[PDB]
Amino acid sequence: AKVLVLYYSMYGHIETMARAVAEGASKVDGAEVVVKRVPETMPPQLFEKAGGKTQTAPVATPQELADYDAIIFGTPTRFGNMSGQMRTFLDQTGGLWASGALYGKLASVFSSTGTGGGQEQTITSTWTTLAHHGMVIVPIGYAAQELFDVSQGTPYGATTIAGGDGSRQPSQEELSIARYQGEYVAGLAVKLNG
Amino acid sequence: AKVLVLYYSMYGHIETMARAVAEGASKVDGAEVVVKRVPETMPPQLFEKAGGKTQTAPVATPQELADYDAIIFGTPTRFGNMSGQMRTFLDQTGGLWASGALYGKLASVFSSTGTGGGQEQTITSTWTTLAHHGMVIVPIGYAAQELFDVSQGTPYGATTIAGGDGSRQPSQEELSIARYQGEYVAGLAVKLNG
Amino acid sequence: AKVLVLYYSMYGHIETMARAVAEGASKVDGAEVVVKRVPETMPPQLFEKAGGKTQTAPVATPQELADYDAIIFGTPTRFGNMSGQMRTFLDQTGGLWASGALYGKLASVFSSTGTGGGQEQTITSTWTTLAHHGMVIVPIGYAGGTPYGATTIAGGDGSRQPSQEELSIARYQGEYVAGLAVKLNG
Amino acid sequence: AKVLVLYYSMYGHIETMARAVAEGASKVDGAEVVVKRVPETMPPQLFEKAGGKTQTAPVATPQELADYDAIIFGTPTRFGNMSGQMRTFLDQTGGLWASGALYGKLASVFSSTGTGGGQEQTITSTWTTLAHHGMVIVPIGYAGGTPYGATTIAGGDGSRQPSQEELSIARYQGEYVAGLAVKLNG
Ligand SMILES: Cc1cc2nc3c(=O)[nH]c(=O)nc-3n(C[C@H](O)[C@H](O)[C@H](O)COP(=O)(O)O)c2cc1C
Ligand SMILES: Cc1cc2nc3c(=O)[nH]c(=O)nc-3n(C[C@H](O)[C@H](O)[C@H](O)COP(=O)(O)O)c2cc1C
Ligand SMILES: Cc1cc2nc3c(=O)[nH]c(=O)nc-3n(C[C@H](O)[C@H](O)[C@H](O)COP(=O)(O)O)c2cc1C
Ligand SMILES: Cc1cc2nc3c(=O)[nH]c(=O)nc-3n(C[C@H](O)[C@H](O)[C@H](O)COP(=O)(O)O)c2cc1C
Ligand SMILES: O=C1C=CC(=O)C=C1
Ligand SMILES: O=C1C=CC(=O)C=C1
Ligand SMILES: O=C1C=CC(=O)C=C1
Ligand SMILES: O=C1C=CC(=O)C=C1
């Protein structure tokens, strides 16, 4: 089964989370995992002025989403919605919609916030779009503690706190939940698709 | 795989929908389908005064939800939320929550409204609760037309219009979508659980 | 202007928050504030088995909601929705709905939760209902903190009591809503 | 009171609705109404390839939103969210957010959709953002019809134009919001 971790990050928090999701997914024998980012929509001059972080991941096209059995979407919280960059990218999936290209495929979502507020709304409003595509939506609930690789309130998807100033980095507790999410979704993908 | 169609109905619209969901689910070889209702919370005197409809389905207990591989929830729209009866029943699932009893099981939702407004919100706010339980959420999207048994804008779950006066009954077009939802969810249940 | 603080509480957390909301609203000249609860739907036997804290505020009827200029609704988070008790109560407001009785009145929401998340969804899914009644919805913005409404964290075991800061935010919500009610209604 | 009707439209449906909203708002004595659009983010080449209807209303800056007493936001339904263009625009209001510039101002939302559903989710997920800014949210209630805000059905092929009834509801939304803006701000 093929698993895509598709993300947008301005300052690297979601990028670090994406790498954790991919790490967990890679634990599943038979899962082929790929990490890509959506295009930055800001001119590079403005992105650099704003202290945006450069990233090694390849840029996804909308059309290539059709190639995967599961897609795990990562976005920062922007006033309780997904980012404009992710929204703009998803608005380019009308062709896939019309052909049924994503119907029945697995989808799951992770996020990041400065100070917590809005994270739930970001995830559930992303689910809405995934449902228009007919995707099967995978929340994380509160999984059995022994399934997390770090011993230790986010049932919709993994999250991390960036701090009011953006300077906080994901903790190992937060990354462990992201790794669980990837492993769990990839396992489902293999169970459904081989 | 065992599939529960669990519903609340005051005037029979959701009951008719539930029967359609169950009919579709029953098409799947290997799916064992059962239909139950949540308890009425109104005293019978008031229910009868209000013109409520008597129903043959057995009354579910909260604990028995643990016995199923998939649960398809039906509720009328009450100001854009599930009914009080369904909410009250789900509030009795704390024990299941604590034990992980519903984690990873399939869930899907159908509804009914008088005049359309609120149906989307009813379904997505029901999804929230299912996600706290760790259930895998199955929207219906816009499925391939040849999969509906009646040739013919509801991607979250099947719906029906009861009319402002409650006198409209589900059309065959609406029931066909409910039947598709049951068949689709039961197929997934068998693919995951045998 | 008349302000109703209308709440459901099983273990007392929302009850404590409701008192704070009312205190804040009472700081506003011209605001007449009343605190009521929705009925418990559980038989007392089952409420007591569950370790409930018996509520003694006056019980509101669904119909009296029409008498207020602003209503501030309190509910615990129950798997990211309002409680069944609050939902059952609101399901009895169909008569008001039909008559337009709450149309244009102010509404605002506060909640309580354990440490599991869901509070944001509880508040926003409560807003949906208020909108069907045509109520004007008042979030708190950036005045487990959300801009949607005041919250308190009760702890996984329910033993935490609202913090000083959480009660201050609840007081602010009452004061702010009551002020808007007076600006609109005198 | 100053009322901004701020919209995004690709094929003209929200543009037509915005004109109606503005007409309604303009019926209110003391309301000063302005209609602006958010920038198109697509290069014109791609907008034209997609059959877009070139928009000519003045383009709003994110910062000028602070100048209004009420803002009525229009966006097409894009898989149950606002459009990427409206989202990109709102993502540029962080400077206002930090300064509290929109706090307490009135907000209301209208939308357009094909026949697929999602309009309710578009409106309510737009409300979330408005709440982060501390805006007071105005649904229309029972004054593809929703109590959340005016809508129009564009058809599966986009060829339907707003109906007379849909434009009447849009006018009502503008009139109602503008009236509340004048009651609050003169
Ligand atoms: C326009 C804008 C809106 C924001 N809205 C929120 C918010 O609603 N809640 C929050 O806690 N943080 C908010 N933030 C902080 C971002 O979520 C934070 O920068 C992001 O999670 C960092 O992830 P990244 O490094 O992957 O870009 C916002 C930031 C911006 C620029
Ligand atoms: C308290 C209450 C609230 C309602 N809210 C809505 C609503 O938000 N939207 C709507 O279109 N119909 C609404 N209705 C109509 C119900 O959805 C309708 O009675 C129901 O779908 C019938 O299903 P049933 O026969 O299975 O009970 C409401 C009815 C009641 C009693
Ligand atoms: C049925 C049920 C569901 C609950 N769901 C959640 C939840 O989704 N998230 C959460 O953090 N706490 C949850 N809780 C814990 C309650 O929110 C907490 O006990 C409640 O806020 C107490 O408020 P009260 O003392 O006013 O009743 C739940 C509790 C019950 C009984
Ligand atoms: C990316 C995209 C997603 C869409 N999603 C939906 C949808 O979820 N439901 C719907 O009924 N129509 C949907 N539509 C159709 C639009 O809502 C319709 O073309 C739009 O309302 C037109 O408004 P405008 O003319 O102002 O651009 C979508 C269109 C596009 C381009
Ligand atoms: O979903 C939840 C249920 C109960 C609780 O305490 C926390 C979260
Ligand atoms: O919001 C609504 C309430 C009741 C009804 O019948 C239709 C809509
Ligand atoms: O989800 C949808 C996408 C496009 C459209 O036209 C209708 C619905
Ligand atoms: O709503 C919010 C916006 C920005 C931020 O940094 C934190 C919260």
mmCIF file with all atom_site columns, N, CA and C in Angstrom, chain B residues 63-112:
data_model
loop_
_atom_site.group_PDB
_atom_site.id
_atom_site.type_symbol
_atom_site.label_atom_id
_atom_site.label_alt_id
_atom_site.label_comp_id
_atom_site.label_asym_id
_atom_site.label_entity_id
_atom_site.label_seq_id
_atom_site.pdbx_PDB_ins_code
_atom_site.Cartn_x
_atom_site.Cartn_y
_atom_site.Cartn_z
_atom_site.occupancy
_atom_site.B_iso_or_equiv
_atom_site.pdbx_formal_charge
_atom_site.auth_seq_id
_atom_site.auth_comp_id
_atom_site.auth_asym_id
_atom_site.auth_atom_id
_atom_site.pdbx_PDB_model_num
ATOM 1   N N  . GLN B 1 63  ? -23.966 -0.923 26.339 1.00 0.00 ? 63  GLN B N  1
ATOM 2   C CA . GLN B 1 63  ? -22.879 -1.882 26.441 1.00 0.00 ? 63  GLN B CA 1
ATOM 3   C C  . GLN B 1 63  ? -22.777 -2.779 25.226 1.00 0.00 ? 63  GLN B C  1
ATOM 4   N N  . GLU B 1 64  ? -23.897 -3.045 24.570 1.00 0.00 ? 64  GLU B N  1
ATOM 5   C CA . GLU B 1 64  ? -23.874 -3.992 23.462 1.00 0.00 ? 64  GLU B CA 1
ATOM 6   C C  . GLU B 1 64  ? -23.223 -3.427 22.199 1.00 0.00 ? 64  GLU B C  1
ATOM 7   N N  . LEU B 1 65  ? -22.991 -2.115 22.145 1.00 0.00 ? 65  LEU B N  1
ATOM 8   C CA . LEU B 1 65  ? -22.258 -1.539 21.003 1.00 0.00 ? 65  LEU B CA 1
ATOM 9   C C  . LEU B 1 65  ? -20.900 -2.176 20.803 1.00 0.00 ? 65  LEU B C  1
ATOM 10  N N  . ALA B 1 66  ? -20.311 -2.660 21.894 1.00 0.00 ? 66  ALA B N  1
ATOM 11  C CA . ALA B 1 66  ? -18.991 -3.293 21.842 1.00 0.00 ? 66  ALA B CA 1
ATOM 12  C C  . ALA B 1 66  ? -18.968 -4.565 20.979 1.00 0.00 ? 66  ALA B C  1
ATOM 13  N N  . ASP B 1 67  ? -20.158 -5.139 20.714 1.00 0.00 ? 67  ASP B N  1
ATOM 14  C CA . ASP B 1 67  ? -20.263 -6.411 20.018 1.00 0.00 ? 67  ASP B CA 1
ATOM 15  C C  . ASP B 1 67  ? -20.189 -6.341 18.503 1.00 0.00 ? 67  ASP B C  1
ATOM 16  N N  . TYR B 1 68  ? -20.093 -5.141 17.957 1.00 0.00 ? 68  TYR B N  1
ATOM 17  C CA . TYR B 1 68  ? -20.210 -4.937 16.529 1.00 0.00 ? 68  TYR B CA 1
ATOM 18  C C  . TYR B 1 68  ? -18.927 -4.467 15.915 1.00 0.00 ? 68  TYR B C  1
ATOM 19  N N  . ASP B 1 69  ? -18.735 -4.760 14.641 1.00 0.00 ? 69  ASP B N  1
ATOM 20  C CA . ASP B 1 69  ? -17.580 -4.294 13.860 1.00 0.00 ? 69  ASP B CA 1
ATOM 21  C C  . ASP B 1 69  ? -17.824 -2.930 13.212 1.00 0.00 ? 69  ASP B C  1
ATOM 22  N N  . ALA B 1 70  ? -19.090 -2.607 12.957 1.00 0.00 ? 70  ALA B N  1
ATOM 23  C CA . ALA B 1 70  ? -19.489 -1.345 12.360 1.00 0.00 ? 70  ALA B CA 1
ATOM 24  C C  . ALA B 1 70  ? -20.797 -0.931 12.985 1.00 0.00 ? 70  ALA B C  1
ATOM 25  N N  . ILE B 1 71  ? -20.955 0.371  13.203 1.00 0.00 ? 71  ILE B N  1
ATOM 26  C CA . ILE B 1 71  ? -22.172 0.927  13.715 1.00 0.00 ? 71  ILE B CA 1
ATOM 27  C C  . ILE B 1 71  ? -22.583 2.079  12.814 1.00 0.00 ? 71  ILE B C  1
ATOM 28  N N  . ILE B 1 72  ? -23.813 2.013  12.299 1.00 0.00 ? 72  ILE B N  1
ATOM 29  C CA . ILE B 1 72  ? -24.366 3.056  11.436 1.00 0.00 ? 72  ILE B CA 1
ATOM 30  C C  . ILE B 1 72  ? -25.476 3.745  12.233 1.00 0.00 ? 72  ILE B C  1
ATOM 31  N N  . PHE B 1 73  ? -25.239 5.017  12.587 1.00 0.00 ? 73  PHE B N  1
ATOM 32  C CA . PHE B 1 73  ? -26.082 5.813  13.480 1.00 0.00 ? 73  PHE B CA 1
ATOM 33  C C  . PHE B 1 73  ? -27.040 6.654  12.696 1.00 0.00 ? 73  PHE B C  1
ATOM 34  N N  . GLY B 1 74  ? -28.309 6.576  13.067 1.00 0.00 ? 74  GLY B N  1
ATOM 35  C CA . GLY B 1 74  ? -29.335 7.413  12.474 1.00 0.00 ? 74  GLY B CA 1
ATOM 36  C C  . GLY B 1 74  ? -30.022 8.316  13.477 1.00 0.00 ? 74  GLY B C  1
ATOM 37  N N  . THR B 1 75  ? -30.128 9.604  13.155 1.00 0.00 ? 75  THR B N  1
ATOM 38  C CA . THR B 1 75  ? -30.760 10.557 14.028 1.00 0.00 ? 75  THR B CA 1
ATOM 39  C C  . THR B 1 75  ? -31.461 11.610 13.207 1.00 0.00 ? 75  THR B C  1
ATOM 40  N N  . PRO B 1 76  ? -32.644 12.055 13.647 1.00 0.00 ? 76  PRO B N  1
ATOM 41  C CA . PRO B 1 76  ? -33.166 13.283 13.071 1.00 0.00 ? 76  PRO B CA 1
ATOM 42  C C  . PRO B 1 76  ? -32.317 14.478 13.457 1.00 0.00 ? 76  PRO B C  1
ATOM 43  N N  . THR B 1 77  ? -32.430 15.522 12.656 1.00 0.00 ? 77  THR B N  1
ATOM 44  C CA . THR B 1 77  ? -31.772 16.818 12.902 1.00 0.00 ? 77  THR B CA 1
ATOM 45  C C  . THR B 1 77  ? -32.638 17.586 13.865 1.00 0.00 ? 77  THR B C  1
ATOM 46  N N  . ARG B 1 78  ? -32.006 18.050 14.949 1.00 0.00 ? 78  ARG B N  1
ATOM 47  C CA . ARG B 1 78  ? -32.617 18.879 15.981 1.00 0.00 ? 78  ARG B CA 1
ATOM 48  C C  . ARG B 1 78  ? -31.760 20.151 16.084 1.00 0.00 ? 78  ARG B C  1
ATOM 49  N N  . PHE B 1 79  ? -32.146 21.192 15.349 1.00 0.00 ? 79  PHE B N  1
ATOM 50  C CA . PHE B 1 79  ? -31.370 22.437 15.327 1.00 0.00 ? 79  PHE B CA 1
ATOM 51  C C  . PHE B 1 79  ? -29.898 22.189 15.029 1.00 0.00 ? 79  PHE B C  1
ATOM 52  N N  . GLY B 1 80  ? -29.626 21.363 14.028 1.00 0.00 ? 80  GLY B N  1
ATOM 53  C CA . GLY B 1 80  ? -28.257 21.102 13.596 1.00 0.00 ? 80  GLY B CA 1
ATOM 54  C C  . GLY B 1 80  ? -27.414 20.215 14.484 1.00 0.00 ? 80  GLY B C  1
ATOM 55  N N  . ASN B 1 81  ? -28.049 19.508 15.424 1.00 0.00 ? 81  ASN B N  1
ATOM 56  C CA . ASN B 1 81  ? -27.371 18.506 16.248 1.00 0.00 ? 81  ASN B CA 1
ATOM 57  C C  . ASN B 1 81  ? -28.189 17.219 16.141 1.00 0.00 ? 81  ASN B C  1
ATOM 58  N N  . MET B 1 82  ? -27.618 16.133 16.640 1.00 0.00 ? 82  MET B N  1
ATOM 59  C CA . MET B 1 82  ? -28.345 14.920 16.893 1.00 0.00 ? 82  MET B CA 1
ATOM 60  C C  . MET B 1 82  ? -29.451 15.158 17.927 1.00 0.00 ? 82  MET B C  1
ATOM 61  N N  . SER B 1 83  ? -30.407 14.240 17.994 1.00 0.00 ? 83  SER B N  1
ATOM 62  C CA . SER B 1 83  ? -31.484 14.357 18.968 1.00 0.00 ? 83  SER B CA 1
ATOM 63  C C  . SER B 1 83  ? -30.991 14.206 20.388 1.00 0.00 ? 83  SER B C  1
ATOM 64  N N  . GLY B 1 84  ? -31.781 14.750 21.311 1.00 0.00 ? 84  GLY B N  1
ATOM 65  C CA . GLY B 1 84  ? -31.511 14.537 22.714 1.00 0.00 ? 84  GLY B CA 1
ATOM 66  C C  . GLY B 1 84  ? -31.485 13.078 23.110 1.00 0.00 ? 84  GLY B C  1
ATOM 67  N N  . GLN B 1 85  ? -32.330 12.267 22.469 1.00 0.00 ? 85  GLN B N  1
ATOM 68  C CA . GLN B 1 85  ? -32.355 10.847 22.796 1.00 0.00 ? 85  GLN B CA 1
ATOM 69  C C  . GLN B 1 85  ? -31.070 10.154 22.414 1.00 0.00 ? 85  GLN B C  1
ATOM 70  N N  . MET B 1 86  ? -30.573 10.470 21.209 1.00 0.00 ? 86  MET B N  1
ATOM 71  C CA . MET B 1 86  ? -29.293 9.891  20.788 1.00 0.00 ? 86  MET B CA 1
ATOM 72  C C  . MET B 1 86  ? -28.125 10.427 21.649 1.00 0.00 ? 86  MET B C  1
ATOM 73  N N  . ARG B 1 87  ? -28.152 11.723 21.967 1.00 0.00 ? 87  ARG B N  1
ATOM 74  C CA . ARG B 1 87  ? -27.120 12.346 22.791 1.00 0.00 ? 87  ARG B CA 1
ATOM 75  C C  . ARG B 1 87  ? -27.096 11.704 24.181 1.00 0.00 ? 87  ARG B C  1
ATOM 76  N N  . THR B 1 88  ? -28.268 11.497 24.771 1.00 0.00 ? 88  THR B N  1
ATOM 77  C CA . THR B 1 88  ? -28.370 10.905 26.078 1.00 0.00 ? 88  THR B CA 1
ATOM 78  C C  . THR B 1 88  ? -27.801 9.476  26.057 1.00 0.00 ? 88  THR B C  1
ATOM 79  N N  . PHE B 1 89  ? -28.163 8.704  25.021 1.00 0.00 ? 89  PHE B N  1
ATOM 80  C CA . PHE B 1 89  ? -27.655 7.348  24.882 1.00 0.00 ? 89  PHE B CA 1
ATOM 81  C C  . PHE B 1 89  ? -26.109 7.370  24.759 1.00 0.00 ? 89  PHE B C  1
ATOM 82  N N  . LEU B 1 90  ? -25.571 8.226  23.877 1.00 0.00 ? 90  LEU B N  1
ATOM 83  C CA . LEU B 1 90  ? -24.133 8.288  23.702 1.00 0.00 ? 90  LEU B CA 1
ATOM 84  C C  . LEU B 1 90  ? -23.414 8.745  24.958 1.00 0.00 ? 90  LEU B C  1
ATOM 85  N N  . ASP B 1 91  ? -24.065 9.583  25.750 1.00 0.00 ? 91  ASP B N  1
ATOM 86  C CA . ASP B 1 91  ? -23.478 9.966  27.046 1.00 0.00 ? 91  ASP B CA 1
ATOM 87  C C  . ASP B 1 91  ? -23.359 8.814  28.034 1.00 0.00 ? 91  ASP B C  1
ATOM 88  N N  . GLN B 1 92  ? -24.006 7.667  27.737 1.00 0.00 ? 92  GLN B N  1
ATOM 89  C CA . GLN B 1 92  ? -23.900 6.474  28.581 1.00 0.00 ? 92  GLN B CA 1
ATOM 90  C C  . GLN B 1 92  ? -22.794 5.529  28.115 1.00 0.00 ? 92  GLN B C  1
ATOM 91  N N  . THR B 1 93  ? -21.969 5.971  27.149 1.00 0.00 ? 93  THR B N  1
ATOM 92  C CA . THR B 1 93  ? -20.909 5.135  26.610 1.00 0.00 ? 93  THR B CA 1
ATOM 93  C C  . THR B 1 93  ? -19.527 5.418  27.213 1.00 0.00 ? 93  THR B C  1
ATOM 94  N N  . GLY B 1 94  ? -19.469 6.090  28.360 1.00 0.00 ? 94  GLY B N  1
ATOM 95  C CA . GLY B 1 94  ? -18.206 6.335  29.047 1.00 0.00 ? 94  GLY B CA 1
ATOM 96  C C  . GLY B 1 94  ? -17.397 5.101  29.442 1.00 0.00 ? 94  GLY B C  1
ATOM 97  N N  . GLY B 1 95  ? -18.089 4.052  29.854 1.00 0.00 ? 95  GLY B N  1
ATOM 98  C CA . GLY B 1 95  ? -17.453 2.785  30.154 1.00 0.00 ? 95  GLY B CA 1
ATOM 99  C C  . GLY B 1 95  ? -16.806 2.147  28.943 1.00 0.00 ? 95  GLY B C  1
ATOM 100 N N  . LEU B 1 96  ? -17.507 2.183  27.828 1.00 0.00 ? 96  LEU B N  1
ATOM 101 C CA . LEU B 1 96  ? -16.924 1.710  26.578 1.00 0.00 ? 96  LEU B CA 1
ATOM 102 C C  . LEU B 1 96  ? -15.729 2.547  26.199 1.00 0.00 ? 96  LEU B C  1
ATOM 103 N N  . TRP B 1 97  ? -15.844 3.854  26.383 1.00 0.00 ? 97  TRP B N  1
ATOM 104 C CA . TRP B 1 97  ? -14.737 4.748  26.062 1.00 0.00 ? 97  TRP B CA 1
ATOM 105 C C  . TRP B 1 97  ? -13.475 4.363  26.856 1.00 0.00 ? 97  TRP B C  1
ATOM 106 N N  . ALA B 1 98  ? -13.649 4.146  28.143 1.00 0.00 ? 98  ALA B N  1
ATOM 107 C CA . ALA B 1 98  ? -12.507 3.921  29.017 1.00 0.00 ? 98  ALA B CA 1
ATOM 108 C C  . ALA B 1 98  ? -11.798 2.601  28.693 1.00 0.00 ? 98  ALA B C  1
ATOM 109 N N  . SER B 1 99  ? -12.539 1.618  28.208 1.00 0.00 ? 99  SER B N  1
ATOM 110 C CA . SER B 1 99  ? -11.977 0.318  27.883 1.00 0.00 ? 99  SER B CA 1
ATOM 111 C C  . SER B 1 99  ? -11.475 0.188  26.442 1.00 0.00 ? 99  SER B C  1
ATOM 112 N N  . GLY B 1 100 ? -11.679 1.231  25.634 1.00 0.00 ? 100 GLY B N  1
ATOM 113 C CA . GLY B 1 100 ? -11.322 1.161  24.247 1.00 0.00 ? 100 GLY B CA 1
ATOM 114 C C  . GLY B 1 100 ? -12.260 0.323  23.406 1.00 0.00 ? 100 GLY B C  1
ATOM 115 N N  . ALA B 1 101 ? -13.504 0.118  23.876 1.00 0.00 ? 101 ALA B N  1
ATOM 116 C CA . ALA B 1 101 ? -14.338 -0.913 23.259 1.00 0.00 ? 101 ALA B CA 1
ATOM 117 C C  . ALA B 1 101 ? -14.704 -0.638 21.813 1.00 0.00 ? 101 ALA B C  1
ATOM 118 N N  . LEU B 1 102 ? -14.802 0.639  21.439 1.00 0.00 ? 102 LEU B N  1
ATOM 119 C CA . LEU B 1 102 ? -15.172 0.980  20.070 1.00 0.00 ? 102 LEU B CA 1
ATOM 120 C C  . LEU B 1 102 ? -14.009 1.416  19.182 1.00 0.00 ? 102 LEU B C  1
ATOM 121 N N  . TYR B 1 103 ? -12.795 1.410  19.745 1.00 0.00 ? 103 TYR B N  1
ATOM 122 C CA . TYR B 1 103 ? -11.644 1.905  19.020 1.00 0.00 ? 103 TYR B CA 1
ATOM 123 C C  . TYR B 1 103 ? -11.434 1.140  17.721 1.00 0.00 ? 103 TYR B C  1
ATOM 124 N N  . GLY B 1 104 ? -11.330 1.864  16.624 1.00 0.00 ? 104 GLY B N  1
ATOM 125 C CA . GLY B 1 104 ? -11.004 1.314  15.337 1.00 0.00 ? 104 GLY B CA 1
ATOM 126 C C  . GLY B 1 104 ? -12.157 0.697  14.577 1.00 0.00 ? 104 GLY B C  1
ATOM 127 N N  . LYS B 1 105 ? -13.331 0.620  15.215 1.00 0.00 ? 105 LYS B N  1
ATOM 128 C CA . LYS B 1 105 ? -14.513 0.110  14.559 1.00 0.00 ? 105 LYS B CA 1
ATOM 129 C C  . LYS B 1 105 ? -15.048 1.129  13.577 1.00 0.00 ? 105 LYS B C  1
ATOM 130 N N  . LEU B 1 106 ? -15.766 0.664  12.555 1.00 0.00 ? 106 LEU B N  1
ATOM 131 C CA . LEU B 1 106 ? -16.309 1.573  11.537 1.00 0.00 ? 106 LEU B CA 1
ATOM 132 C C  . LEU B 1 106 ? -17.592 2.245  12.015 1.00 0.00 ? 106 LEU B C  1
ATOM 133 N N  . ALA B 1 107 ? -17.730 3.524  11.669 1.00 0.00 ? 107 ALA B N  1
ATOM 134 C CA . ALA B 1 107 ? -18.902 4.307  12.006 1.00 0.00 ? 107 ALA B CA 1
ATOM 135 C C  . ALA B 1 107 ? -19.357 5.119  10.823 1.00 0.00 ? 107 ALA B C  1
ATOM 136 N N  . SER B 1 108 ? -20.679 5.308  10.715 1.00 0.00 ? 108 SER B N  1
ATOM 137 C CA . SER B 1 108 ? -21.223 6.109  9.639  1.00 0.00 ? 108 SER B CA 1
ATOM 138 C C  . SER B 1 108 ? -22.576 6.640  10.130 1.00 0.00 ? 108 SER B C  1
ATOM 139 N N  . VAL B 1 109 ? -23.075 7.705  9.506  1.00 0.00 ? 109 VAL B N  1
ATOM 140 C CA . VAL B 1 109 ? -24.204 8.437  10.039 1.00 0.00 ? 109 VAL B CA 1
ATOM 141 C C  . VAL B 1 109 ? -25.206 8.797  8.926  1.00 0.00 ? 109 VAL B C  1
ATOM 142 N N  . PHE B 1 110 ? -26.501 8.737  9.241  1.00 0.00 ? 110 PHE B N  1
ATOM 143 C CA . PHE B 1 110 ? -27.578 9.191  8.364  1.00 0.00 ? 110 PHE B CA 1
ATOM 144 C C  . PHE B 1 110 ? -28.567 10.037 9.147  1.00 0.00 ? 110 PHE B C  1
ATOM 145 N N  . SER B 1 111 ? -29.314 10.885 8.436  1.00 0.00 ? 111 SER B N  1
ATOM 146 C CA . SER B 1 111 ? -30.180 11.818 9.137  1.00 0.00 ? 111 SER B CA 1
ATOM 147 C C  . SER B 1 111 ? -31.453 12.111 8.339  1.00 0.00 ? 111 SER B C  1
ATOM 148 N N  . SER B 1 112 ? -32.255 12.988 8.923  1.00 0.00 ? 112 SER B N  1
ATOM 149 C CA . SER B 1 112 ? -33.547 13.415 8.383  1.00 0.00 ? 112 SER B CA 1
ATOM 150 C C  . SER B 1 112 ? -33.768 14.856 8.866  1.00 0.00 ? 112 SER B C  1
#
